[PDB]
C-alpha cells in the first residue's frame, strides 16, 4: 500500500535551523508593539505557548496526503514516474517567509520547477487555491493551536497569499525582514534573504 503521505523531509541540521528560526519569530512577534495592538483580532501572550502543538521530530513539506490509498488521487500520484524517480532523492527548499495566524504558524516554501513536478493536482482543490499558481500551498508546519490540525497550515497560507495578491506597507522591522499585518490575526515575515533547507523526498508511514 501507499504511504501516509509523500513529502520532503528536512535533515536534522536543516530542521533545527528552521525550527529555531520559527521560535525566535514567535518570541519577536509576541514582543512587538504592532502585534499587541491587534490581540483582540487574535485572541478573545506567549505565542510559543499558544502554538503548543509542534512537530515532535524533523520538519517536513508535504506534497500529497495518501492515507495508504484512502485519499482521493493517491494512487494516481504515486504511479507517476517523476515520483518514483525522485523517491529518495535530495532536494533544496527555499523558505521565503514565516507566518502566523490564530490557528497555525508555518513557513512558506517556494518550489522550483523541478519540485513543482512533484506537486499533485487532484480534482478537489479548496477555494483559496483560485487565482494563485500551483504549489503556492507548499509549506512547513511549525506549530498549531490546541484544537487545530497541521493540515490547516496550508489553508492558512493560501488564505494569506490571496490577500497579498491584491497588492501593502510593512508595520515593523524584524532582524530577518519586514513584518506585515494582513488583518484578522494574520502576520507575515518577508525574509530579506530566503533560507535554504536540505530535504529528502520520500514517503512517511504511520
Residue numbers in the entry: 164 to 207, 215 to 337, 340 to 378
Task: Quote the authors verbatim.
In the F235L structure, the flexible active site β5-α7 loop (amino acids 319 – 321) is in the closed conformation. This loop is often found in a mixed conformation, and its conformation depends on the reaction step. As the active site of dCNPcat is empty in the crystal structure, we determined an additional structure of CNPcat with no ligand bound; this was successful when using the F235L mutant. All earlier structures have included either nucleotides or buffer components. The positions of the active-site water molecules, as well as side chain conformations of catalytic residues were nearly identical in dCNPcat and F235L, suggesting any changes in activity of dCNPcat are related to the replacement of H by D in the protein, solvent, and exchangeable sites of the substrate. Our observations allow us to speculate on active-site dynamics that take place during and after catalysis: The β5-α7 loop in both dCNPcat and F235L is closed, confirming the closed state of the active site in the apo form.
2′,3′-cyclic nucleotide 3′-phosphodiesterase (CNPase) comprises 4% of total myelin protein in the central nervous system (CNS), being the most abundant CNS non-compact myelin protein4. CNPase consists of an N-terminal polynucleotide kinase-like domain10, a catalytic phosphodiesterase domain11, and a membrane-anchored C-terminal tail, which contains a cysteine residue that undergoes isoprenylation. The catalytic domain enables the rapid hydrolysis of nucleoside 2′,3′-cyclic phosphates to nucleoside 2′-phosphates.
